[PDB]
Design a protein around this ligand. Structure first.
Ligand SMILES: Nc1nc2ccccc2[nH]1
Ligand SMILES: Oc1ccc(Cl)cc1
Ligand SMILES: Oc1ccc(Cl)cc1
Lengths: 188, 185
């Protein structure tokens, strides 16, 4: 990840005008849509939290959690820490990132700070559901000037995406003011 | 450097009891002694600053500044960013690190934050002197509980080093309370 940290602008885009900041959300959304398309129901939920973090949930199979034979860590960690631009870029440029994977009846949890995992991926409990959740706090050392998420920028893009991804329910929620939207095109 | 950031205790030592914190200084000192040993004047200066940073100076040749052909960056940056344990570990676990190299008639400067160079090593002026200086601010995300440098822990180790490295003068200065020592065999 040190390559991304050296020159963040080359990977995410402009880090001052807010375009790079919103590209962080859309990179994560692309991965979530990818996961949601594997299942039958297919719903993603994008939430803008009151602390200007964004979470993206899907109800898909869940990112692989088993140990990678070469890397010697969970396959989830490899995805988050090895170099669309990749979710590893989002992780690198997030001062905090929370990963929650529900898979094979188990809840898996891991926390990152500036791309560095705080502990190995851990099974913390049980679940009937499946899916992946990523919540990230954009790094204020990287992202300057425009640091807060504009609802309209996300709402517009997710609406455009709904028509290209048939059968995928996309929910947008803003916990700052309670505003929400539901984009679900069922064509074909 | 992510391997170091992932498990800092495994490289630097215990990050809670103060062992790792002080080992940061000693790793930098090891490189300063190597550089001092191959200079005419053989002195290093370890300074504890008021803002809880430490700087280590030598008056040796200055570490190499030319572009490393494989890595494509200054040889100094390769030393600071690629894996005694090494100054790259110290760089990775410092919230800020200032590098100053005096070599071949030129002053070179570079700043790192958490091991990440803020710009390429740059020529900032002219000089007659030679040597290397590294000042580092230990990351308060990594180093907990014991966050401040104890003078006597550093003085004890530098005394031991002065006997082993007989030719090398070692000065220790505390800018918080004006305390100082000069170890030389
Ligand atoms: N605050 C902060 N910024 C960082 C950048 C890279 C690795 C660790 C870091 N901690
Ligand atoms: O919902 C998701 C799924 C995958 C990833 Cl990397 C992030 C969010
Ligand atoms: O004085 C010195 C010399 C070399 C290094 Cl890497 C750091 C400090």
């Amino acid at each position: 990840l040190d390559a991304v940290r050296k020159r963040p602008g080359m990977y995410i885009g402009d880090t001052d005008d807010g375009t790079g900041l919103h590209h962080m959300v859309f990179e994560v959304v692309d991965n979530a849509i990818d996961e949601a398309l594997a299942g039958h129901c297919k719903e993603i939920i994008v939430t803008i939290h009151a602390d200007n973090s964004v979470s993206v949930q899907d109800d898909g199979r869940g990112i692989p959690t088993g140990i990678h034979p070469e890397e010697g860590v969970s396959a989830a960690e490899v995805i988050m820490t090895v170099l669309g631009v990749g979710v590893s870029v989002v992780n690198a440029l997030s001062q905090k990132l929370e990963l929650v994977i529900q898979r094979e009846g188990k809840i898996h949890r891991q926390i990152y700070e500036h791309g560095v995992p705080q502990a190995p991926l851990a099974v913390t409990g049980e679940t009937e559901k499946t899916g992946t959740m990523v919540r990230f706090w954009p790094s204020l050392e990287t992202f300057t000037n425009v640091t807060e998420f504009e609802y309209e920028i996300l709402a517009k893009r997710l609406r455009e995406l709904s028509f290209l991804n048939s059968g995928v329910s996309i929910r947008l929620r803003d916990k700052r003011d309670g505003k929400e939207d539901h984009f679900h095109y069922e064509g074909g």
